[PDB]
Amino acid sequence: MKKLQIAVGIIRNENNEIFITRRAADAHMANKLEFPGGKIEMGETPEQAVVRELQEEVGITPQHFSLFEKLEYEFPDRHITLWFWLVERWEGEPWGKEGQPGEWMSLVGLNADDFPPANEPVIAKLKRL
Ligand SMILES: Nc1nc2c([nH]c(=O)n2[C@H]2C[C@H](O)[C@@H](COP(=O)(O)O)O2)c(=O)[nH]1
Numbered sequence: 001m002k003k004l005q006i007a008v009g010i011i012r013n014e015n016n017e018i019f020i021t022r023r024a025a026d027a028h029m030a031n032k033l034e035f036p037g038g039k040i041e042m043g044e045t046p047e048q049a050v051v052r053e054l055q056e057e058v059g060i061t062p063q064h065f066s067l068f069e070k071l072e073y074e075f076p077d078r079h080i081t082l083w084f085w086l087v088e089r090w091e092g093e094p095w096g097k098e099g100q101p102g103e104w105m106s107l108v109g110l111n112a113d114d115f116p117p118a119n120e121p122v123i124a125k126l127k128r129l
């Protein structure tokens with residue numbers, strides 16, 4: 001079974017809103033809401049990966065960020081390790097840089113059912129802040 005390391009960024013503004021994108025209809029976890037992110041490549045660290053992925057996907061450079069949660073999840077056809085970075089400072093303004101839907105969502109209003117099931121403990125912990 002495919003085994004992947006994935007780095008994602010929880011992009012939180014000053015009004016307790018998170019920048020959330022929606023996955024393509026033909027992707028793994030199609031049509032789900034997501035934290036921007038993607039696969040950690042050979043030769044790059046988890047910290048470098050979340051910077052690169054947020055630059056590619058939403059056009060920001062995260063800075064002074066922290067590891068909010070790291071977990072493993074077994075999907076029906078792949079195993080992934082997710083690195084959830086809490087990003088409260090960045091350069092740039094997030095947008096749908098890859099043509100994908102993106103918008104600011106209140107943290108209290110997040111519905112874990114809208115996200116991949118791997119995100120369930122993270123969304124709960126975020127609402128604990
Ligand atoms: N980008 C992103 N991927 C997620 C999240 N939760 C989650 O299970 N995944 C999975 C879906 C994909 O299998 C993989 C991400 O890789 P891509 O973004 O390259 O598709 O990680 C998330 O919040 N953000």
Ligand SMILES: OC[C@H]1O[C@@](CO)(O[C@H]2O[C@H](CO)[C@@H](O)[C@H](O)[C@H]2O)[C@@H](O)[C@@H]1O
Binds near residue numbers: 066
């Ligand atoms: O691992 C993140 C953790 O490390 C600290 C320093 O103790 O921050 C460092 O690492 C971050 C991720 O690369 C950088 O963004 C940051 O500038 C650097 O100091 C903690 O702040 C953080 O919890």
Ligand SMILES: [Mg+2]
Binds near residue numbers: 036037038039057
């Ligand atoms: Mg991605």
Ligand SMILES: [Mg+2]
Binds near residue numbers: 037038053056
């Ligand atoms: Mg990507």
